[PDB]
Amino acid sequence: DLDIALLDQVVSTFYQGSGVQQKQAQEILTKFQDNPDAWQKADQILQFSTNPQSKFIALSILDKLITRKWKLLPNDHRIGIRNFVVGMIISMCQDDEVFKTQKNLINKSDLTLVQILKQEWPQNWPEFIPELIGSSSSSVNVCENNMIVLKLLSEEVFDFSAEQMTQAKALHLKNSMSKEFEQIFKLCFQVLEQGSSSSLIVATLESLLRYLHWIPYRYIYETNILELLSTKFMTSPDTRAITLKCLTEVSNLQDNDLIKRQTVLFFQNTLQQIATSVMPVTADLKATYANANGNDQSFLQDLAMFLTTYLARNRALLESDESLRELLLNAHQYLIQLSKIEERELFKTTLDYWHNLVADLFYEPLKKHIYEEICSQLRLVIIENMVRPEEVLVVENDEGEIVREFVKESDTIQLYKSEREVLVYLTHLNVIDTEEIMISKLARQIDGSEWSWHNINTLSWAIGSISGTMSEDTEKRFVVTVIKDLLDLTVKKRGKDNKAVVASDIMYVVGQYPRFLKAHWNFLRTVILKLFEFMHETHEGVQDMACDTFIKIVQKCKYHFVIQQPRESEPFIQTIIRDIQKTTADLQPQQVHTFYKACGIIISEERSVAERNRLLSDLMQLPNMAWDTIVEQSTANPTLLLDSETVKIIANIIKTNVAVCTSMGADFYPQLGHIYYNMLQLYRAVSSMISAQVAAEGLIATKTPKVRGLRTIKKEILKLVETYISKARNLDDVVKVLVEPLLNAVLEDYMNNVPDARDAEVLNCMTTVVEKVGHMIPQGVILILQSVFECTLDMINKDFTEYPEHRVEFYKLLKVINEKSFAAFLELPPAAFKLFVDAICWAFKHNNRDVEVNGLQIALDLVKNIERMGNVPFANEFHKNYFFIFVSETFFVLTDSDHKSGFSKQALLLMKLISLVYDNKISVPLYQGTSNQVYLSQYLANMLSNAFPHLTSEQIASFLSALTKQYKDLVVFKGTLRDFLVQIKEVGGDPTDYLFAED
């Protein structure tokens, strides 16, 4: 269809054009490259095209042919393609302009040759390596490119062969390269010591970097390549980084004093060479990194990787000899300088090592004196680089509400914890030095020499991280001093801006020292009351700080709020509850809810149940009065929920209940009961209004402010119920009182809602119910299935994309139903059990991990359930009806291109299914005295031959043979499956590959 000139035009349009025409050219190119017979256009393209991009694409088409259908080709074609690719590579190498400016095409060509080597070498090309080595002496460019070829070969065989090749083929190629590496190393070594050309030597070092991953130690330690690397190539600016990378891998390669002294030697040479030719230990790397000449940033990255890797493995080697003391401390001084570089990922690399060191010094304090200056330096470095321990996300939800929420397990948070751990160690190693550094840094905030918001915050985070380290008495003197200075600093600073910053840090520090707070009630009470005072401060961030600190402190110190302290006439929680209208008057709703949540934490600490309920009652007085009032108004006004102000008040009422229930859990029951029935009634009301309007106006009604206000009420109600039930201690009251009205209210409404009004949160609510009490409500589970299964399935069985949330929640619900209450399927008509099996297989076919995990898990659990029933009519009938359905469907997703995330579960499921037959657990023939074993093999062989006709009969037999012998060894069984996955994508696969485990 497309001749050469037109292809060149399409390529040029795609890469250099834009917009619609670029898009149109792409679709032409994609079709062209995917054409099975396109490879015959390839050599003509490679011969005649005036476009390097066209040639790149031609090589891709060639690669497809080589990796998939090489063995179909006559031996003439193979040699022809072979000679052509080799010839093409050589031409580009002798062409100096092309060699310099078309590296991507030459690399692509080299990779193509390596693909051929994977097919032909060495059994059909035994002289390749000798032919490669001698061709290197013909031209300096061919020699350089040969290093690239050898590099790619090593990568494809050792680095990326797993899952790309069968285990047998991979072993074959690894052993092949192992047998001929002797002469490869000779060429590599020779070039390294003789070589003039920078680009040649760099390329040689790049290849060696990959060899080091797998080559025998003797090539590294019984030659003198280590000495050559550590002396010659560090003085050179173009080879420094790549040499450090090689030595780093060497530092990851015993009872051997020779190898020990060589390990010491290359480190000694490298460090000496760096100090001599590159930079001294006193070099400001922080500034050097910041200017970033050429690739200096990468060199310093590679240096930190080298030092940390070596020292983590070989520090004890350098310590066992005092002549190496200078080398040891210089290495660590370099690390100190590197740790000052403003580059997080670089800093994290050093920190991982400092953690190793200071832990060792703690458990071996006799070595401590050696590193005293290093540690003192390190204390300051970490203190000055402490990151924030807490992060908050500000997001708009689906109802248009702006919501704060704390980040969990982020990189920043993990970094804080690592920094804290090191600082905790360092504090114990020398508490005086630690205290002196923090105090003097604080003094430099006071005198203004180092004053900034970032620096005072950073220091606060550092100080707040070492609680429980100094002993209680030293801690007391330390915190008193710190709070004193910070209080004076607040007075000293001009501007509400700066004052708020220091004040927030005062509050942060005290919140980090609960032992200090608990020991002194008057001070703790003073802290809380000032936080209350801050809740009236409109200055940005202050109220959030006050509320965050409040709940943080009560989390640690709750006990002191429920008991009656000395010189108090009542537990302070009573004081808090009474003034709650005044305290929270200026807060935003979300902040008020946090306040109530904090009170809930405290009230849960009351051991007397009568008094706990009384406290809860008093706490909820304001929202209950608002709720009671609105309940009364509901009787007097049928159009009550059309008032947006009323809707908003009701929303905040429920949110307040959710907040308190979150912290109180099981203790929240009496409050829940006070509103439960009216709340459920409210739910049906607002959900009806939503569904009615969505039906009349369509999907766009979901975005309207009115509907979103109603859906907020709807979702908060479900959230409240879910929150309590998940925390309930009394499951009887859940079942006997809560569940039945809940199911009637939400399941019926969900069922009668129009599809675009059904909330997936209902399914998630039901999942929580079933998880908690599903084993106690078999009839309730059935009602759930009757209400949500078919109507939800019909929403998600047209495509794989629509209603993404219902899809996830649907199969989460099905999983826990199948887990906790499988009895529900035993009572249901066959037509519905069929729908159940259909739904599972439908989840298999998703390119959606969140859906596919549960689909697999359900299938696994289902087979486990039925197998458990034993020799019983239901189990036996299931086997006749569905055994091969699951077998073939599992084999389908296994062999399909994009279901790799479920591979582990698929393999397990297949093992389990095979177990049912080859362990004779199925008491009944599966076919309409032939044993089930041989009918299974016949089914599979026929299934596989049909689906993959290019497979030989011996391939299939050998595969099924291995499978039915390995179904109890997961690791081996997986390996056999991966081998099969490799072989179904190519032609002429070796059937003896499946004997890999046995030999």
Binding site: E740, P741, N744, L747, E748, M751, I782, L783, L785, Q786, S787, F789, E790, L828, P829, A831, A832, L835
Partner: peptide
């Protein structure tokens, strides 16, 4: 109807 009609209280 395949699962059966729901009985709501």
């Amino acid at each position: 109807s395949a699962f059966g009609a729901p009985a709501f209280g």
